[PDB]
Amino acid sequence: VNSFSGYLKLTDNVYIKNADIVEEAKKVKPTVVVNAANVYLKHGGGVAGALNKATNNAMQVESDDYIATNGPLKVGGSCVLSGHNLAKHCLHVVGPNVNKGEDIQLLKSAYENFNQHEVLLAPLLSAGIFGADPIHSLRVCVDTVRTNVYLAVFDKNLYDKLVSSFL
Ligand SMILES: O=C(O)C[C@H](NC(=O)c1ncnc2[nH]ccc12)c1ccc(F)cc1
């Protein structure tokens, strides 16, 4: 038993809620919150800008040190950093950004990173301003992630569409 509230069950291992992921993180303090990052960990907008703002820019400061030491991530890759005031850890996961012309085929690889963690609070990878089809992304999530994932969807209309179309 865990401490997430009001989530809708989709499969053996995936739940979903129309909620602000920052507020879900501040309430639950999960072991892992997932960020929808880019390879440079430049947290400008979307999930990343929202999470980083909630950390008072501490996420960005930590991320800049990470990049200075290690270089950029791969599209499809991830790194574990601090969750700051939001979670124990933040799993920064790079899905493909279709508005950058990146390969949507790497979405499955991106979701595979979730399998290294027993329980995660996460956004829908590559959706929103990342420009991929959100129905497709939820499908890839359910067909790839085997650990327990709690998906938080900001946009109400998107949430309603995702639930009503889910197979
Ligand atoms: O769930 C959604 O609507 C889409 C989601 N966006 C957000 O979660 C979001 N965007 C802007 N400001 C925000 N503030 C608090 C949350 C938040 C998203 C998912 C994958 C991405 F690669 C990029 C965005």
Curated annotation (Swiss-Prot):
It is a multi-pass membrane protein. Inhibited in vitro by GRL-0617. It is found in: Host endoplasmic reticulum membrane. Residues 1-167 form the Macro domain. It catalyses: Thiol-dependent hydrolysis of ester, thioester, amide, peptide and isopeptide bonds formed by the C-terminal Gly of ubiquitin (a 76-residue protein attached to proteins as an intracellular targeting signal). May form homohexamers. Interacts with N protein. Responsible for the cleavages located at the N-terminus of the replicase polyprotein. Participates together with nsp4 in the assembly of virally-induced cytoplasmic double-membrane vesicles necessary for viral replication. Antagonizes innate immune induction of type I interferon by blocking the phosphorylation, dimerization and subsequent nuclear translocation of host IRF3. Also prevents host NF-kappa-B signaling. In addition, PL-PRO possesses a deubiquitinating/deISGylating activity and processes both 'Lys-48'- and 'Lys-63'-linked polyubiquitin chains from cellular substrates. This is Papain-like protease nsp3. It comes from Severe acute respiratory syndrome coronavirus 2.
